[PDB]
């Protein structure tokens, strides 16, 4: 049933701070979603991308996240900060210990 | 720094005929890698579109990742993986900014 997402963000150099702020504001409300198992934020070693790794209980839970007030606000603003669109990969677990 | 936790995303794009072989190769990594003192997690997924297999790995330190990369299981895997794929493994090393316990 459960699902995960990798989302990769390549900010414009002048928009890195704004991107970090936008993603920072997602963490609390997203982790508070009934169907969110985890939601973690990283920077690539080469510093070129911020990466979110997200895990949800079901496809329904992921749909709900994508309709949430916090998500909608983020989605309204994120595109304008990036060199290219968010690279999103939805995942289905094959062997996830938890 | 070197004592700080790290994560790794590794993406694999098998040839269609090699998919079950790749799954078996990656499966064999799971028990010994999770057993590493320094491995926090090591989880296998497939992409929603079925084209990729993806490992998400978390290590207690960069040192632990280096230990992983020197291990007998890793070296066996490294010797064989490329031959199953349409392109080399796509590997990203990650530094946590906000990773919950």
UniProtKB/Swiss-Prot annotation, chain A:
Residue ranges of every copy of the ABM domain listed in the record: 3-91
Keyword check for Transcription: no
EC nos: 1.-.-.-
Keyword Ribosomal protein: no
Function of the protein: Putative monooygenase that might be involved in antibiotic biosynthesis, or may act as reactive oxygen species scavenger that could help in evading host defenses.
Name assigned to this protein: Putative monooxygenase Rv0793
Keywords, ordered alphabetically: Monooxygenase, Oxidoreductase
Provenance organism: Mycobacterium tuberculosis (strain ATCC 25618 / H37Rv)
Gene3D superfamilies noted in UniProt: 3.30.70.100
Enzyme superclass (EC): oxidoreductase
InterPro entries registered for this protein in UniProt: ABM_dom, AI-2_Isomerase_LsrG, Dimeric_a/b-barrel
Complex and partners: Homodimer.
GO MF assignments: catalytic activity; monooxygenase activity
Higher taxonomy: Bacteria, Bacillati, Actinomycetota, Actinomycetes, Mycobacteriales
A Pfam family reported for this protein in Swiss-Prot or TrEMBL: ABM
Cysteines joined through disulfide linkages: none
């Amino acid at each position: 049933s459960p699902v995960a997402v990798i989302a990769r963000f390549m900010p414009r150099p002048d928009a890195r701070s704004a991107l970090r702020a936008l993603l920072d504001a997602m963490i609390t409300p997203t982790r508070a979603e009934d169907g969110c198992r985890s939601y973690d934020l990283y920077e690539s070693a080469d510093g070129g991308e911020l990466v979110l790794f997200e895990r949800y209980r079901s496809r329904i839970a992921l749909d709900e996240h994508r309709g949430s007030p916090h998500y909608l606000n983020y989605r309204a603003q994120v595109g304008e900060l990036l060199t290219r669109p968010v690279a999103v990969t939805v995942l289905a677990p094959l062997d996830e210990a938890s």
